[PDB]
C-alpha cells in the first residue's frame, strides 16, 4: 500500500549525492548576512506599515513584526544548497507548505515585473510581456512571501484547439502539480507550492496598500467580489476572477531568496519559440540543431546542456511549451541547477503530447545517469508515475488538483521519453547517450 | 401549420392605414428589381415590411444562398461587424458566431460585457415577426466559407492581415474592432467555415436619413453607478412630459420595444432610430438585437421597468401577447417552427424557446398589475377602425 512511501524509501532516493557539499560555499545564502538583511526588511516594514495605519486612522493594535529564525521561509532560504532548492524528504518543506496554506496574509501588491511596466497596455501587441498577467505577491505573518496565481479555468477544461502557447491560460493547479512532479523526480528545482482558498476581500483587498490594486476590485451583477489584471481587462483579452462571492482558490509559490542576497541570471533557452502566428525557429526545422548548440559557450562544457535536457523532460511531462527563459543562481556557476519558476501553463492538454518540447533530448541525444534511473523506475507499476503523483497531490486543500486524464498522461509521456533514450541509443550507443558524471 | 394558423387569426390581418405620398419612403413615379430593393421601396410610415410580402421571404433566401462578391470591415469599432456585397448589388451586415449554443453568459458579466451572437439576431427577426411588430431588418443565418467568402474577397488590408492558421491547422481571423478583437477571441472554423447572421441592409443614409434617439431608460453603462430610473419609482411621470414622449403614439412605441427586449433579455437598448422623412409619428426600428438569448436560466426584470413605471400598453399587442400564451398559439412551438428554415437551424437552444413563454406570462401578468392599480381604460390604448 501507498506507492508514494515506497518511492522515497527506495535505494535511489537515499544514496548520497556526488559531489558532497563542503558547506559555506555550497549554501547560496550566508547565514549571518541573510539574517541581518531580513531583520532590516522587517524593521522597515514595521515602520512604513505603522505610518500607513496612522494616515488611514487605525489604532496600531498588536505588537510589531518579529523576525524569528524558526520561520519556514527563513529555514527554506538557508537550506538552498548546490544540490537543489530543497532537501530530499525535508521536514522544513512540509512545514513550509502547511504555513502558506494557513497563515494569515498581511500585505498584497502587484509584484515587480509588472509595476516596472510603468504604462503599458498595447492592445496591438499579441505577446505582451509576462508582466500583464493576473498574479500578486502575498506576505504572511511570519514575514514570508509567495507568488499567488488565481484559478483561471475549470479542472475538466483544456486549452481549446486553435490556441497558441503565448495566449494559453495560467492554471494555479498546474503550478502545484509541477511541484509535486518536481519532488517525485528528485529534480528538486521548482519552489514548494501549495493550493489555498483565499478570501479575496479579507486577505487581498483589505490588506493591500496599493491604491491601484484597491481600484480593480468591483462587484458583479451576481454580487461577487471580483478583481482583474488592469491591462488585459482594458484590451478585453481576459475577464475578471470573481470569488463565490469572496472565496477564490489559487496556488501560492514560495519566494526565492531576495536578489540582494542571491542574484539570478535570466538566460534565454536555446530552443525558444518564435512567439508569432507564423514562422519557425532554427531548431524547429534542423534535426542537427544541437550539433550547433554543443559548440556554443557555455554549452561546450557538456554539463550545462544536460541540465537543459532535464528541463525539457520536466516540461514535456507537463506540456509546458512556454519556457523561453530559465533562471540560474550565479553563485553555482555554469554547472548550477536550473530553477523551474513559472509552470502555470503545463497541464492544459491531457489528450495531446507536444513532442517539440522534447527536442533537446531528441536532437542532442544525451541524458543524465541519475535522471534516467528515476525515469525508468517511475515506469514500473510498483512506483508508477501517475500513482505516486495522484497520492502526493492528495495532501493539498485543492484536491483533486489534476483530473484523471492528466495523471494518466504522465505515464504515457514517460514512455515517450524512455522510448527516445532507448531509441537514440541504437544510433550512438550507451557511450554518448548516458553521462554518468558524479 | 401551427405558424400558418397564427397568420390566419384575425389579429394578424389588421392592415395599416391607407398610405399617401408623404407616408411611403421611396415614391416610384419594378419586377426585375432585386429582393433587397423591393424591401427598401416597401418601407412605409408604420412598418418595415408587409405581413405577406413575397420579397421579405425571398430576401431571406438571398442572404443565405446568393454568392458573395466583396467583404469589408465596418468603420470605427464596437464588436466585429462585417459588411458583405452580393452578386445583386445588395449588402448585409454580418455578425459571426462568437459564442456557442448551449452556453450562457456568465453571471458575473455586466450588460456591457456580453457577446453579440447571430442566434439573437436571427431569432429577434422571427420574434419581432410573430408579434406583428415588423420593426427589424430581415436576417438569415449562413454557413460562410471564411476563405472564398471572407479572406479571398476583401481588399481591407486591416481585416485580411488577421487570417492566421492555428495549431489545430484551422483557419482563424479576428479583425480590428474595439471589443473582443484580438487573437484570444479569434473566430475559427473547422477547418474553414463559421456561421453568422446576414442582416439585410437598411437603405443608405445618402437617400434616407435616420434619426437616433436616446432611450430614457438607458443604463448607466458603468459599474457601481445607478441610472436614475433605478431610483425614481415614478420616473415615467417625467418622461410623459418631455419634448416628444408626451405624444400617445410615442409613449407606446417604447412599450412594444421593451416587451420585445425583455422577451429576449436584451438589456442593451441604449438608443433607437426613426426615419426622418417620417418625423415623430412612425414606428421605431428594432436594430442591433444581438445581445439577447444569452441566458436561458434567467429573466432580467430590470428590462421591463419601462412598462412597470409607465403602466401603459397597446391593446393591439395585448390581445396578441395573450394569444401567444395559449397552447394552440404558443410562442414556443410557433418560434421553433418559424426558425426551422434558416440553414443554421436550430438557431435557438431549446430552453430559450421554453423561456420565451415564461417571459410572456410575466409580461402578461405585469399588465395585470398595472390594470388593477391604474384601471383598464388608462393602461390600454385602442386600435379598431
Ligand atoms: N501611505 C500610502 N499611501 C498611498 N499608497 C501607498 C502608501 N504606502 C504604500 N503605498 C503603495 O503601496 C505599495 C506599498 O507596498 P508595501 O508598503 O507593502 O511594500 P514596498 O516597500 O512598496 O515593497 P518592498 O517591500 O518590495 O520594498 C507601494 O508600491 C505604493 O504604491
Ligand atoms: N516561486 C516563484 N515563482 C515565480 N517567480 C518567483 C518565485 N519566487 C520569486 N520569484 C520572482 O523573483 C522576484 C522577487 O524579487 P523582488 O523584486 O520581489 O525582490 P525581493 O526578492 O522581495 O527582494 P527585496 O524585497 O529584499 O528587494 C519576483 O519578480 C518574482 O517574480
Author numbering:
A (entry chain A): 89 to 526
B (entry chain C): 159 to 187, 220 to 575
What does the literature reporting this entry say, word for word?
The Fam20 proteins are recently identified kinases that regulate essential cellular processes by phosphorylating proteins and proteoglycans. The human genome encodes three Fam20 paralogs: Fam20A, Fam20B, and Fam20C13. Remarkably, each has a distinct biochemical activity. Here, we use a combination of structural biology, biochemistry, and phylogenetics to elucidate the molecular functions and evolutionary relationships of the three Fam20 kinases.
